[PDB]
């Protein structure tokens, strides 16, 4: 039951639907750099609490995010050379952040992908870089030798990132640590000669949930399908789980749901 702060940066070279930079605390988005806006912007009410002590938060993040956007344009150009590609549409992605576990141990990561495949990532524990292929070994070079910059990243991942994460969690605890009760509804699909029993489970938060169809009380996976766990616009989640059940046998099947919002698990039949 840990918490994390996570940034996701995306750069595409030939256009589309056209730079993207999003910040999360525990899959709640709290900032984004609108490549239209050229501004790092708040996405939730509680992040403005950063302004009392750090009134420059928005300018600093904006200038840095702008810097990263320009760097990524350069990166996309250099990787074309490294992979000797005359030039199509290509993608550069960067993810980084930290994890603070409930036992007060921490982790962190710092990774780049080219065209959706790993390119290079920092190993915090050896202070070296893992190149995914022989072109990335060009990058592994410059960066393995930049001892000082590699330490800034270890410091950032191990300390700076954790300190902001701990600030953010307090700032946004009322919504970040809330629980919303799952809403479980069982429907029944075809009259004409087996039936599919559908369990819709929606409006729940946080994301973690255990949903199983049972048969005489036991977990059952035969002829069982499930949807995506997908976000509602109000930050809550939705999914479904189905089973094909038998003539005359409906009453053996119940939709079993376990979640932080349920002090006791629920078992819902048609």
């Amino acid at each position: 039951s840990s918490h994390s702060m996570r940034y996701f940066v995306t750069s595409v070279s030939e256009p589309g639907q056209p730079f993207s930079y999003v910040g999360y605390v525990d899959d709640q988005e709290f900032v984004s750099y609108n490549a239209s806006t050229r501004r790092y912007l708040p996405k939730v009410p509680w992040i403005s609490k950063v302004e009392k002590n750090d009134p420059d938060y928005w300018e600093r993040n904006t200038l840095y995010a702008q810097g990263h956007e320009r760097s990524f344009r350069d990166h996309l150009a250099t990787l074309a050379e490294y992979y000797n590609q005359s030039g199509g549409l290509h993608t550069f992605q960067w993810m980084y952040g930290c994890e603070l576990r409930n036992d007060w141990s921490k982790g962190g990561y710092y990774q780049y992908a080219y065209d959706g495949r790993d390119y290079i990532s920092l190993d915090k524990d050896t202070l070296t870089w893992m190149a995914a292929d022989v072109p990335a070994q060009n990058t592994k070079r410059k960066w393995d030798a930049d001892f000082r910059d590699n330490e800034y990243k270890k410091t950032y991942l191990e300390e700076t990132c954790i300190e902001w994460l701990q600030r953010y969690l307090n700032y946004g605890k009322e919504t970040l640590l809330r629980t919303e009760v799952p809403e479980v509804k069982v429907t029944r699909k075809e009259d004409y000669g087996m039936e599919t029993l559908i369990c819709r489970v929606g409006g729940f938060y946080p994301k973690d949930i255990d949903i199983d169809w049972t048969r005489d009380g036991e977990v059952w996976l035969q002829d069982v399908f499930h949807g995506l766990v997908s976000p509602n616009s109000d930050g809550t989640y939705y999914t479904w789980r189905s089973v094909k059940v038998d003539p005359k046998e409906r009453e053996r099947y119940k939709c079993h749901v376990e979640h932080d919002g349920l002090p006791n698990p629920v078992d819902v039949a048609w």
Binding site: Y7, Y21, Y64, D74, T160
Partner: peptide, 9 residues
């Protein structure tokens, strides 16, 4: 808070 400035690839 985002990371600071980056180096050429």
């Amino acid at each position: 808070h985002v990371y600071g400035p980056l180096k050429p690839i």
